[PDB]
Design a protein around this ligand. Structure first.
Ligand code: NA
Ligand code: NA
Length: 329
DNA sequence: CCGACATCGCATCAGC
DNA sequence: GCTGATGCGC
DNA sequence: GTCGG
């Protein structure tokens, strides 16, 4: 639905959401505001009163009240006062840098560091991760067009298979659901040799990251363990042509017997996972990001049910398989 | 009235 | 040195 | 902030 409808209200709730997250350090109020802004963005009617909105799930007395003030005046006093607020606006801004959460941003603004320029001058006060977020402050705020993601995908699948023909790599996320653009690339990886009660051969994941660094696809590392890599990557530029911006890429090494449970979860969407959790249980099963287990008559979950594909999970809960395209909810 | 709210691997801080 | 707590992005 | 036991 057109943003014009209640865009003024959704933006108001989102702005409030970021302040709770970055300044007040109130994550729950953050999600509360986002949930509200979200359900309000879906409502196919121009809201005329807070009471109308209050009907919607996620909108309570306070937000219905704020919505009223906004409709009557065109803005919100508490919000106007927050924007003109020196520290709060500096603190909010600083968190846009990957690596700087509410706490670091709170600390920088304290000692006088308020701008991207202040950070660029205090490089040794920033950890490895934060210097990379600074270095790509702009790039990290851009989105990734699908075609770009495909090019990016071709390279991941090609290099993984080059390291070992048994690796299985699946680019999940909104991408797998067919989305037109993305903010990042989440690649789930697995190898037959890696199972829940097996070895992690601390190189299955290393050998892959290392391979992607060799062909110069991965350009920076934010964090890397035996099962989770988080870094930056970039597509090869087409000779003397605006080189592609640096992109965020995560790689997960999951056990083969939990691999598909992993692919299901990271493909989502977030709504779709809730309908399955909800459904799965009524059918007598418990579904987490790792496994699917039967629930005895006393509520006692049993051993993890075997899974060799995504469909297997759907079959356990009396639900027909659904392509990642129809998993928007 | 008052607790839940989604999740967890990894880097790094705090403390012994 | 080590382990646990915290911060972070997801 | 919202929902709900
Ligand atoms: Na409501
Ligand atoms: Na940040």
């Amino acid at each position: 639905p057109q943003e014009t409808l209640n865009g003024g209200i959704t933006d108001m709730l989102t702005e409030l959401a970021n302040f709770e997250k970055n300044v007040s350090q109130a994550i729950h109020k953050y999600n509360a505001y986002r949930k509200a802004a979200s359900v309000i963005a879906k409502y196919p009617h121009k809201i005329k009163s807070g009471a109308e909105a209050k009907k919607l799930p996620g909108v309570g007395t306070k937000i219905a009240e704020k919505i009223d003030e906004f409709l009557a005046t065109g803005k919100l006093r508490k919000l106007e006062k927050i924007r003109q607020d020196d520290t709060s606006s500096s603190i909010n801004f600083l968190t846009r840098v990957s690596g700087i959460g509410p706490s670091a941003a709170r600390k920088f603004v304290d000692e006088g560091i308020k701008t991207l320029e202040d950070l660029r001058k205090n490089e040794d006060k920033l950890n490895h991760h934060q210097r990379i977020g600074l270095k790509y402050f702009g790039d990290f705020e851009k989105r990734i067009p699908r075609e770009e993601m495909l090019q990016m995908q071709d390279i991941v699948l090609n290099e993984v298979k080059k390291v070992d023909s048994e690796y299985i790599a699946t680019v999940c996320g909104s991408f797998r659901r067919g989305a037109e653009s993305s903010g990042d690339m989440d690649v789930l990886l697995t190898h037959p040799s890696f199972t829940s009660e097996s070895t992690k051969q601390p190189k299955l994941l290393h050998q892959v990251v290392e391979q992607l660094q060799k062909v110069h696809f991965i350009t920076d590392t934010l964090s890397k363990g035996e099962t989770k890599f988080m870094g930056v990557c970039q597509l090869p530029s087409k000779n003397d042509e605006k080189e592609y911006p640096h992109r965020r890429i995560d790689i997960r090494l999951i056990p083969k017997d939990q691999y598909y449970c992993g692919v299901l979860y990271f493909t989502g969407s977030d709504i779709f996972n809730k309908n399955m959790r909800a459904h799965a249980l009524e059918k007598g099963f418990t579904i987490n990001e790792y496994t699917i287990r039967p629930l005895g008559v006393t509520g006692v979950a049993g051993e993890p049910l075997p899974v060799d594909s995504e469909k297997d999970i759907f079959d356990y809960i009396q639900w027909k398989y659904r392509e990642p395209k129809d998993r928007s909810e």
